[PDB]
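Q: I'm writing a short explainer about Subtilisin for a general audience and would like to include a description of its predicted shape. Could you first generate the structure from this sequence?
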Amino acid sequence: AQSVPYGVSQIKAPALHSQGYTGSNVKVAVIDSGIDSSHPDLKVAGGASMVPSETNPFQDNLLHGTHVAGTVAALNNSIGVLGVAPSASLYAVKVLGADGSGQYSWIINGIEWAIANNMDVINMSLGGPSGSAALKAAVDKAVASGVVVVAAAGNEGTSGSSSTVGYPGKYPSVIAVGAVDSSNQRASFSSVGPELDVMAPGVSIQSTLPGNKYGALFGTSMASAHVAGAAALILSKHPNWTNTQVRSSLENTTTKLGDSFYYGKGLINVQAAAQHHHHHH
Ligand SMILES: [Ca+2]
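A: Of course. Here's the predicted structure. Afterward I'll give you a sentence or two in plain language.
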């Protein structure tokens, strides 16, 4: 039996699945620890490793890239879970080594790979505390080329009056995603600041794990995965929308929650976003 994780229901993805919008032919890059291509509930289309010591992007040692991938696109069948965009073309972009660490060059190389390979959506479920001209240049180039760029806001919680949003979520060109729970309350670990754009489910998120397993993780990575999947649903309905239009559709149709510093525009609603982009007209 297949179970629909509550977070996929919470953002109203099943309403679009029932209309035949499932993210078909939309290319989504998961820039993370790789994706297990052997999992019966995931269809990996391609990808690349940017880790010099670890040449196989389909060997997921850290487990979380396979989990993010399942939130984006776990297949619609009789097993496992169900992704937000179960027909999406999933690409594994491994930028973290078996030890948990990732040089900034590897992440930027992964973004450049994604532009060269014409990804429609890039999900970056990683943050750093610091940016660089090259990291900003890569995400700005990706958005200039038409890519929807989504990133986890970070898991740094509240710090005084400061922004704790990580990079590259902190850059204006990137959609920064925080985490709520099933009650729509902000998760205590979710990073905060004026750079936050939207929230999505990020606690107790059931998804695919390597070796034909399933389990729950928590984090703004999980939240970002929902929004990346939602962008793919939107592009399956509206293939000629610009990335600016897809971004506005998600931001302008949220369920309003608390203050923008903690919640951004609120919780995404992909059913409402798919009605109209609300960019200018
Ligand atoms: Ca399934």
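A: For your explainer, you could say: The chain is about 30% helix and 15% strand.
Q: Perfect, that's easy to follow.
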